[PDB]
Design a protein around this ligand. Structure first.
Ligand SMILES: [Zn+2]
Ligand SMILES: [Zn+2]
Ligand SMILES: [Zn+2]
Ligand SMILES: [Zn+2]
Ligand SMILES: [Zn+2]
Ligand SMILES: [Zn+2]
Lengths: 511, 518, 519
């Protein structure tokens, strides 16, 4: 519980903001039929031009205002194109001689927008908000979007709009109007978007927290504080309990750290009959220097490694969403074997042979492959709960930047139905995931000469699949999936976390 | 048609063995419900024991010789297990008082053997042939096996047994003695017979492709590779055309020709055609990357691990298409028209090579900013795709050793497949299942296209920021298929068998199965 | 003259070669130290040691024939100077004839038997006193013990280090260079060391000649110009010579040697100089030298840090050593021997015409070779050059080559490595090393690595894919191209270039010549 320090100035807790300006935004959804009102604030239309790549802007909806109508006349809206993500907006006086702001965001030439297109649209939207001091924004949907994509649009606008100043030292809007066809069906999605937004923004807060602030001790303390605020059971496992359990793999990674290993175990149990038990496991490495296999090669981005607990952050954000929504007929376990991978006289070293909590011995070939070591014991622990689904999520292998890149997470697993559910949850959360195979032919490269199994392949380069084959050895009789978010977790362009997985994991629990 | 040379000692053609020793093998399939005759040669039993990891071996088939039976009594076979890949040699005097050789290969503890497990059995089998001078091999199938797994057995056996001595001179392996007959004892032998011919045609198509890949770059060049295809087309009675530089100039193939500007061998564009003597219901175009050697260009492969010495394989895609042409041209399917295309060149370093930053114009008008001269595969394939599209086909399928990222995505076992059309990918995925050449579907993330927006040309050859290289190349290729169904098979990672130091001929059976089950 | 191709009219068409060096005009006199040292004009320098104590005091032992110079060199007056190896002091005084003289000393340490390395350092200190001083005579007095072979080494090393190569200086000539015209030497039993004076002079130029060739840059010294250089040398020495061009090389089926050159603008040229003695011929010897006039690496370009591509004008040091040898042999004229000097010269370059990694090529002995790395081009040329050598029917084949950069990690910059298939031949090489004072050290041909040359397609791999001991694996490769003849192979990659002085060593000329005049 007490966070160790080297000097008195070392911080002793993660600053968390629970009450954000987003939560104060009044959101009204009006039916697109009957026309729009432009009586104050910024009014933005979302218009596309199917077929006509880069075609002009044309506004179809009738606005109850003589002056702005004159502005949105086809003859005047012609000079502007629908290039996906392009935008302009103008200030003027309306019928009532009130200064308003009218504009549009180009939604391209495709009709069925993707999550990435939507993201590009929102980015233009937020760009106007951050350089315009208004109190109301109104968005008119002259494009076709389903309920999930609509909810996704709100979540993404909320998340991108929020600016995280916790670590800074030396005026948001208050109303949101949405003009959309079928408003009544879309209304039930607004408050859920608000929950998903924060769940995503909470994970981002932890990830963004640097490793001096966000260490194994303080990160478990935040988990506990989230459980109590949410009224979930919470048990934190310490070194003594961890030795008694024999989690050799997990403890080896921490041997070199000044912060004791802390294993997080949150539990949500719905009030009624329990029909499905689920274990969610997240890689929780608060800083991964690589260990004696130091991240010293050009491109190894050691300065980003505060993010190697992104899986844990996702699983916790899921706890917020799950505890806040309080679904029926489930028991969810949120697990994370937290630690820190450092270079010290005390660290485990390459070549060490260690014994996991299920008795299998493992030969360490590379100390930077530590995430699969910690997940190994977390998966043994999880299977001891007698759950139906074990889903882990982790920034495991940098190889994913060369397979799927920075947009799509990869998912591996030992059960077709579980991989199917994760994909469908990817469709409804709009968090993109792609199914990759656990190629059995590669398993023999983990045949250790001395230990029971190798930690890494010495030859095979498809590390994302090799790790998957290693993890498989630690689940004996339970549907299990594995989601490698190493490439998607961090938004390199915006220089901030994405919060990837929260909504994906929640949709998996909910539907 | 004439291969340029620098010295009179430079080879002017690819050595190609068409009548291989495997071809000289007389295969018969006998019905096991009738006993196995153990006269001469080596006769091998494929046995398993479902249950414990290394159960014991138990011969089930009726052996048509008293002495052998008394020898193969369970009491004698108890000492040996059926560990997958295990084998043992037996010697005895049969009923005729003659010396016979018999043995077994462990088929593991599984009932329905896996493809990868079948291979391991063939290799173990081949090992028994390699240091032995035998005239006949008999194999009794005491394991469950479908027709498709029987053919795959023959197929794999033929390819591994075949030893490529085209380039030996004083190290010709004496003691090499191929068997002359192959006997197969199987249940319902009458139904598996149909697969012997097919396992033969599929075998050679693959070994053919492997001969072109293995052929060093000095032997196998753009001129000599096109010469080889014309001979193949002439044997198979396929229509053939070879576009030379002047025609390629007239067709305005700036991307393709720019790659070869630095080679000493002129560009040669292969176009073979098969069409059957009935109505045509499907018209396919198969495109193969045909880079006979890939130095990288001015973006020289000099970084560690770039394996410049392996780049004679950068035409395995072309080899696969020509290989498919043999199988299709031999079996001759009905109601199809198939164009086998390849834009062959050599990516070299010279005062005549194209440069990074160069801007070139493809045959479809699109200007291209070259960002890395070693991304030359997508350039040649761009002009080949627009060429294929002009033919008015239903399916355009290309197969290429395009991107090294494949090793980090799927590894050395599975090829990746990309496309713009679910239906065609599904047909490739099915064909992958039945040819037994594994492939995994990867997506063309549209979000990355923006990193191809060039500031001066119409399109970027490469992305500057994105590292998912296989996906980006697929996005580039996508810009040269305007309205046709098109899939893309990246074989950069599966083409070369690194452990054996020999090509796999990957793609031949896949492409054929695609053509024949349509 | 055989015409050298050019790109522009300014490209040089010949290697500039100086044959009449200032060292050829110095008159050498050797005096017996018994009977007195006279102190004439110029500089007089004593070589003094003090066995026992390091940095010990210097005492002048020999008898000087001058009262003033004697009084000045009194032991009590010399104790202020030590004998630390290399130290040196200059003295100035008037003699018996009221004339100014200059004397001094150079310290030779406290060890009894100086090594060639120690002699090198003593000579370097002498040269330092010769530079920036307009002297007409230098005299050296040997108050130290050296055998006949080490005394010759002193003269040659003195001559070599004294020489300054200005062939490529135009506006920056040292307008202050003035060489001595006379050199006196005082030593005990002088009559026995006299015979070494003329051999040392011959040995100096032979080595300085190879040095000129090596330092000549690849645009001056290319396959055509260097073969032209050898022709002229054979012509001045009445040596037999035949220069095989591409046409014969194709007839001779030298596919390995030709492949390496396919990418050059200078056609391959094969040098073959012959010295046949007039007497009954008892030994026939073929010396083979690696002749790469510039080694870019080929498509396996030298781009890795520390690859020193800018040094690769020296990949023909073996050929230069062998030609330097030919000068000595042609000049000294051994009596009962037949010597063939061979070099398969070419240039390893990047072009559309170059051979590629992976290429399979056929050597003149019909063996096919899979090219795994184009930067290992030397073993390819030597393979064919060895086949040609055995066809001549000699008693010994000895090749010398800057073959493997591993040499820098095994024996370093001082000792070369000798490999071979024949203990007796390797002993003759080791013997010639002692007498030439050019250090060689025997390294093994480890047969266990042979298997890693087993190509899957060709007859043999050019390179091992797993074994890192390049210098051994190449020896295994070459050994496959000599079937029934004693053959040794001397890798000089590490020792050829003198990094400190920024010039070539000419290493191997004297080693090889001594071998030629061996029992
Ligand atoms: Zn790591
Ligand atoms: Zn990590
Ligand atoms: Zn390339
Ligand atoms: Zn390529
Ligand atoms: Zn070299
Ligand atoms: Zn070299």
């Amino acid at each position: 519980s007490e966070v160790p320090q080297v000097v008195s100035l070392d911080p002793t807790s993660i600053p968390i903001e629970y009450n954000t300006p987003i939560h104060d935004i009044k959101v009204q959804v009006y039916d697109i039929k009957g026309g729009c009102n432009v009586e104050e604030g910024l009014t933005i239309f979302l218009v596309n031009n199917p077929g006509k790549e880069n075609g002009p802007v044309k506004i179809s909806s009738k606005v109850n205002d003589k002056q702005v109508s004159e502005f949105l006349k086809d003859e005047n809206m012609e000079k502007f194109n629908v290039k996906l993500g392009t935008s302009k907006h103008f200030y003027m006086f309306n019928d009532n001689k009130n200064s308003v702001a009218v504009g549009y965001v180009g939604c391209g030439s495709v009709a069925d927008l993707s999550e990435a297109d939507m993201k590009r649209v929102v980015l233009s939207l937020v760009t106007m908000l951050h350089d315009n001091k208004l109190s109301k924004l109104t968005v008119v949907f002259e494009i076709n979007v389903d309920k999930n994509l609509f909810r996704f649009f709100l979540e993404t606008l909320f998340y991108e709009y929020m600016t995280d100043e916790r670590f800074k030292s030396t005026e948001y809007i208050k109303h949101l109007g949405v003009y959309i066809n079928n408003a009544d069906t879309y209304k039930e999605e607004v408050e859920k978007a608000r929950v998903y937004y924060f769940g995503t923004y909470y994970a981002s807060q932890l990830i963004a927290a640097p490793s001096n602030y966000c260490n194994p001790v303080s990160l478990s303390n935040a988990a506990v504080e989230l459980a109590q605020k949410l009224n979930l059971e919470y048990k934190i496992l310490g070194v003594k309990e961890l030795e008694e359990l024999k989690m050799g793999a997990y403890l080896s990674v921490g041997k070199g750290s000044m912060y004791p290993n802390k294993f997080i175990h949150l539990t949500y149990k719905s009030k009624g009959d329990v029909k499905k038990k689920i274990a969610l496991v997240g890689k929780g490495i608060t800083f991964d220097s690589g260990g004696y296999n130091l991240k010293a090669a050009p491109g190894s981005m050691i300065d980003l490694m505060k993010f190697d607990m992104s899986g844990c952050a996702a699983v916790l954000g899921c706890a917020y969403c799950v505890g806040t929504l309080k679904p029926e007929n489930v028991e969810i376990h949120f697990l994370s074997a937290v630690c820190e991978n450092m270079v010290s006289k005390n660290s485990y070293r390459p070549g060490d042979i260690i014994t996991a909590s299920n008795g299998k011995t493992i030969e360490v070939g590379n100390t930077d492959a530590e995430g699969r070591l910690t997940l190994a014991d977390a998966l043994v622990y999880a299977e001891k709960l007698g759950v139906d689904y074990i889903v882990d999520i982790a920034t495991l292998t940098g190889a994913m930047l060369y397979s799927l890149g920075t947009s799509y997470a990869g998912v591996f697993g030992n059960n077709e139905e579980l991989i199917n559910k994760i994909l469908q949850s990817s469709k409804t959360s709009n968090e993109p995931v792609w199914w990759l195979p656990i190629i059995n032919e590669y398993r023999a490269t983990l045949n250790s000469k001395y230990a029971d199994i190798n930690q890494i392949s010495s030859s095979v380069k498809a590390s994302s699949i090799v790790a998957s084959l290693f993890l498989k050895e630690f689940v004996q009789n339970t549907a299990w999936a594995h989601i490698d978010i190493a490439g998607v977790s961090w938004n390199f362009k915006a220089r901030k976390p994405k919060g990837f997985g929260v909504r994906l994991l929640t949709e998996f629990v909910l539907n």
